[PDB]
Design a protein around this nucleic acid. Structure first.
Lengths: 161, 57, 51, 87
RNA sequence: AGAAAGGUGUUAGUU
């Protein structure tokens, strides 16, 4: 599963660079941070070093929020920028949806996607997605769809109602 | 006229001799109505080539 | 007869049919392009591209 | 759409909206009071296209049942019959 | 179907 990781590092009084990125484990996070730093300020991986790698939890994991995520796509042309909003209860939860969505619609891989910034939009007016606004209606009430539910050859036909 | 040419093209629609027959037939049908090097010449020929008052009285 | 016999006869649902045909022309062109096949498809595509 | 709900009796048993039938397209009827709340719960754009037709079809049938007049110069059935008669 | 460009076919976004 994905996990938020805060990576702080600097080249061997050089400035300390700290950033939040999402990785399955620490080793992926540190390599990802180095690759991000390599293309930003041009710091060699061999020369630099990591001073702190910390895991970040969700301060309010049982509260529904809306997360706006800005990312950079690599496509056939390899240049694209989008912004998408997800409603869930964790920053890492939305990121998994973001990765799952883009690998679905746009046939993406984890390496070609880099998170530019993730923010928590707490204003309903700031939401730019019709689905998010509809889900935030005060009268949200809908029947559960796509239910469909060993012991093969059941005795009576399913009620399914 | 352009539609008539398209209609004529629609009506029109060894290998050197076979294309020569095709070159003749395609142009002759237009005249009646009115390998890569060989195909280039065939395209060149096509490229270069390309009452109411009385009835109402 | 003589001169504009048709015009003289007319003077002495066409609009509705013409309007219906014009309205259906937008859908007919898209359907014809999608259903076109063979050499005629290339000719239709070339004509649409030129237009 | 997330919710594309719209509007004798309105009994909606087995999707038949007998006052008529609605089995052809999955849209709900719900017989909400005098109206029939023809709901769509996260369906498809085809359902949105059908409801606009269904709403007019149900209204035309209701209008025809109450007073179909003649309109010489059954709603769709009468118009198709008139077109067939004209042809 | 599936293992140059057209489409009043569709779904997510940019200006």
């Amino acid at each position: 599963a994905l996990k938020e990781y805060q990576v702080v590092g600097r080249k061997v009084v050089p400035k300390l660079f700290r950033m939040r990125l999402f990785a399955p484990n620490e080793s992926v996070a540190k390599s990802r941070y180095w690759y991000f730093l390599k293309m930003i300020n041009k710091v060699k991986k061999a020369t630099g070093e990591i001073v702190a790698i910390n895991e970040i939890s969700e301060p309010k994991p049982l509260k529904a929020k809306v997360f706006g995520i800005w990312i950079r796509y690599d496509s056939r042309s390899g240049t694209h920028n989008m912004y998408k909003e997800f409603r869930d209860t964790t920053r890492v939860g939305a990121v998994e949806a973001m990765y799952a969505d883009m690998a679905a619609r746009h046939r993406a891989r984890f390496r070609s996607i880099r998170i530019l910034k993730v923010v928590e939009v707490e204003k309903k007016e700031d939401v730019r997605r019709n689905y998010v606004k509809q889900l935030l209606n005060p009268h949200l009430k809908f029947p559960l769809p796509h239910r469909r539910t060993k012991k093969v050859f059941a005795p009576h036909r399913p009620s399914t109602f | 006229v352009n539609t008539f040419l398209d209609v004529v093209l629609s009506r029109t629609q060894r290998i050197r001799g076979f294309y020569g027959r095709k070159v003749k037939f395609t142009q002759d049908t237009i005249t009646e109505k009115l390998l890569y090097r060989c195909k280039q010449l065939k395209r060149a020929a096509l490229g270069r080539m390309a009452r109411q008052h009385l009835s109402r009285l | 007869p003589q001169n504009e016999y048709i015009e003289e006869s007319i003077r002495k649902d066409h609009e509705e049919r013409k309007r219906k045909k014009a309205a259906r022309e937008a859908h007919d062109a898209s359907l014809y392009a999608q259903k076109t096949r063979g050499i005629k498809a290339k000719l239709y595509q070339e004509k649409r591209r030129k237009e | 759409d997330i919710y594309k709900d719209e509007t004798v009796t309105v009994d909606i048993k087995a999707r038949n909206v007998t006052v008529q039938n609605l089995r052809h397209v999955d849209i709900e009827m719900k017989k909400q009071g005098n109206t029939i709340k023809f709901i769509v719960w996260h369906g498809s754009r085809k359902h949105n296209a059908c409801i606009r037709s269904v709403y007019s079809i149900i209204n035309n049938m209701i209008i025809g049942v109450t007073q179909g007049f003649r309109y010489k110069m059954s709603l769709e059935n009468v118009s198709q019959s008139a077109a067939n008669i004209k042809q």
